[PDB]
Amino acid sequence: NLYFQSMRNFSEDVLGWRESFDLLLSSKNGVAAFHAFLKTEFSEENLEFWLACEEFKKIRSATKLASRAHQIFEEFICSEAPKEVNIDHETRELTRMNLQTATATCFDAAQGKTRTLMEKDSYPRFLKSPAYRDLAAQASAAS
């Protein structure tokens, strides 16, 4: 029964966000809610960058890889990028060198740093927000 399935899925989705950052990041709803939260803390570019990397690494063509890699570097990685993420020179220079022949692992180091930035800081605050706390109460009612 579809409604019942939905209720159970809602419950399982929302309560998993509390259990691991992996589960939040794996969820359409989770990522969307966390994004909205991050905007309130002016840090949503970490998640935008992360999500960009997840979509990038599925690209198989060499030319589409190079083109997207340059788009992502210019938006998120380069000094004075419009959504510059908070990474060190070394990670930034590595990433620029990876651009020479952009493969699916082009952003791995920068992605890992960005995940930790969110995981250490904004993710535990998210789970303490009134919003999340209201959602989790509903989810425990949805079972």
Domains, the chain, in order of start with CATH, read 10-41+122-143 (1.10.196.10), 42-121 (1.10.167.10)
Resolution, angstroms, 1 dp: 1.9
Residue partners of 104: CB distance under 8 A and separation at least 6: 56, 57, 59, 65
State how far the Cα of 76 lies from the Cα of 53, in Å rounded to an integer: 11
Query: Could you count the other beta carbons within 10 Å of the beta carbon of residue 88?
Result: 10
Q: How was this structure determined?
A: X-ray
Q: Give me the sign of the Cα torsion angle 128, 133, 139, 143.
A: positive
* 3-state SS string for 24-58: HHCCHHHHHHHHHHHHHCCCCHHHHHHHHHHHHCC
Measured in whole angstroms, the distance separating CA 117 from the mean position of its chain's CA atoms is 11
State how far the Cα of 138 lies from the Cα of 10, in Å rounded to an integer: 9
* C-beta of residue 7 within 8 angstroms of C-beta of residue 143: yes
Which residue type does 92 have?
Answer: R
Burial 125-137 (b: 16+ CB within 10 A, else e): ebbeeeebeebbe
